[PDB]
Amino acid sequence: NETETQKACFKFLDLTSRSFSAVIKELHPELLLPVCVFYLVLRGLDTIEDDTSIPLKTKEPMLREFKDYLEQDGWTFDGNRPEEKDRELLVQFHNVITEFKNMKPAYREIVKDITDKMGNGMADYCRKAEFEDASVKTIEEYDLYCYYVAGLVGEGLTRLFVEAEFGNPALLSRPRLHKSMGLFLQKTNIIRDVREDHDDDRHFWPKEIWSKYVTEFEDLFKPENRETALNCGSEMVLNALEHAEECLFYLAGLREQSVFNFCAIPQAMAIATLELCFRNPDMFDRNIKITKGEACQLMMESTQNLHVLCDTFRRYARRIHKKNTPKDPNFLKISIVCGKIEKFIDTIF
Numbered sequence: 001n002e003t004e005t006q007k008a009c010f011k012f013l014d015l016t017s018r019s020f021s022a023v024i025k026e027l028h029p030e031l032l033l034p035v036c037v038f039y040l041v042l043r044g045l046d047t048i049e050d051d052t053s054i055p056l057k058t059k060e061p062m063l064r065e066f067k068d069y070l071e072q073d074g075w076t077f078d079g080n081r082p083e084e085k086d087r088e089l090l091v092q093f094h095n096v097i098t099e100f101k102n103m104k105p106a107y108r109e110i111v112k113d114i115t116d117k118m119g120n121g122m123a124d125y126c127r128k129a130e131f132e133d134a135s136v137k138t139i140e141e142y143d144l145y146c147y148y149v150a151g152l153v154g155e156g157l158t159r160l161f162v163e164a165e166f167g168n169p170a171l172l173s174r175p176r177l178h179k180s181m182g183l184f185l186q187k188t189n190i191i192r193d194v195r196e197d198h199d200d201d202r203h204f205w206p207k208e209i210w211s212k213y214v215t216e217f218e219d220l221f222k223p224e225n226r227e228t229a230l231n232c233g234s235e236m237v238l239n240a241l242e243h244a245e246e247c248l249f250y251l252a253g254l255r256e257q258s259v260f261n262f263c264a265i266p267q268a269m270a271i272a273t274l275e276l277c278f279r280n281p282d283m284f285d286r287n288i289k290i291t292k293g294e295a296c297q298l299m300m301e302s303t304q305n306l307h308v309l310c311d312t313f314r315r316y317a318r319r320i321h322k323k324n325t326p327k328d329p330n331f332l333k334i335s336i337v338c339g340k341i342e343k344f345i346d347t348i349f
């Protein structure tokens with residue numbers, strides 16, 4: 001007995017999250033529709049923020065006010081460029097609104113708050129870009145951009161988990177944990193996608209890091225600077241790896257198996273992707289991905305328990321530890337963080 005509003009939301013879930021839709025749809029029914037609503041709302045936010053054919057005069061209010069649109073039956077939007085990939089989510093958004101309002105009031109307050117905080121951070125970002133540079137210059141800015149597009153997702157999901165008693169409530173008292181969750185994923189994708197993003201005039205690597213390796217960011221992609229480029233990505237990987245232990249801390253707080261799988265799978269994939277990118281020069285030439293046999297192993301190792309997941313983390317931390325070379329100016333610090341991850345897992349298990 002699935003309503004068509006529900007079928008549409010799940011259809012759009014397949015079309016926007018692609019492979020991830022499968023693990024979302026295996027979520028415990030207490031949070032299956034809430035998490036689905038949460039994702040389609042944030043994806044609806046992205047479809048507005050990313051369409052450069054929408055002028056700031058129109059886009060900025062939609063982003064700041066989107067939390068209030070969730071309360072308006074039949075809200076639609078057809079002002080995307082006719083070729084935006086996820087247009088139809090916003091033109092048929094009345095299904096998300098229907099299912100948003102069917103949600104328990106505690107879930108609606110969480111999703112509405114995150115939509116509000118996130119949409120306004122996006123609107124602030126979209127504004128600066130139009131009237132300024134908006135280039136990531138400091139690690140602090142880098143970390144701030146990741147908190148708004150990914151750390152806030154972690155807050156929302158954690159708030160839903162704790163509300164459904166699927167997560168230890170102490171996860172809300174230590175918000176560095178869900179922040180590390182989102183930053184680990186977002187930083188790994190920013191590292192791996194650096195060429196793709198640069199070929200679309202998007203640059204998220206902080207100048208505080210890449211300026212120690214090249215004079216201009218574009219220099220990273222020239223074949224003659226492949227050595228400094230590797231060293232730069234190494235420090236990028238080092239910065240991402242500093243979140244891994246707090247990620248293990250967060251997963252230890254999850255109390256329901258389908259919620260564990262939903263959070264553990266992307267984390268295990270992130271550390272594998274990080275290991276594939278570490279000292280890999282292909283990262284600056286194309287989009288590299290982990291092999292299908294590896295991804296399929298990881299999916300088995302991320303859908304069991306915390307012990308099995310920690311062994312996967314220990315394995316890829318050791319692989320990064322071994323690829324680490326003294327020629328790298330980040331040599332010592334990479335070994336230290338890898339050792340801390342390995343020795344921490346050895347202490348638990």
Ligand SMILES: c1ccc2[nH]ccc2c1
Pocket residue numbers: 150153154155157178181182185262263266
């Ligand atoms: C758990 C916590 C934070 C997250 N960010 C994206 C997915 C996800 C899962």
